[PDB]
């Protein structure tokens, strides 16, 4: 089972937020595929 990506806290730059969104989307796809 795919582990849920953790949220970048503190010094979180827009790119890492976008990365969190993309990785969360990947989580959704892999979770749905699971």
Question: What was the experiment behind these coordinates?
Answer: NMR
CA distances from 27 to 4, 6, 12, 30 (A): 7, 11, 20, 5
CA distance 24 to 29: 9
**φ and ψ at residue 23, rounded to 5 degrees:** -70, -30
> What is the residue-wise DSSP string for the chain?
-PPPPPPP-SS--HHHHHHHHHHHHHHHHHHHH-
Let me know: does 5 contact 24? Beta carbons within 8 Å. Answer: yes
Compute the distance between CA of residue 12 and CA of residue 29 in angstroms, rounded to an integer.
Answer: 24
Query: By the 8 A CB rule, do 30 and 2 touch?
Result: yes
Backbone Cα Rg of the chain: 11
The CA distance from 13 to 26, in Å, is 20
Are the C-beta atoms of 27 and 5 separated by less than 8 Å?
yes
């Amino acid at each position: 089972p795919p582990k849920k990506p953790k949220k970048p806290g503190x010094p979180a730059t827009p790119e890492k937020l976008a990365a969190y969104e993309k990785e969360l989307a990947a989580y959704e796809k892999e979770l749905a595929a699971y």
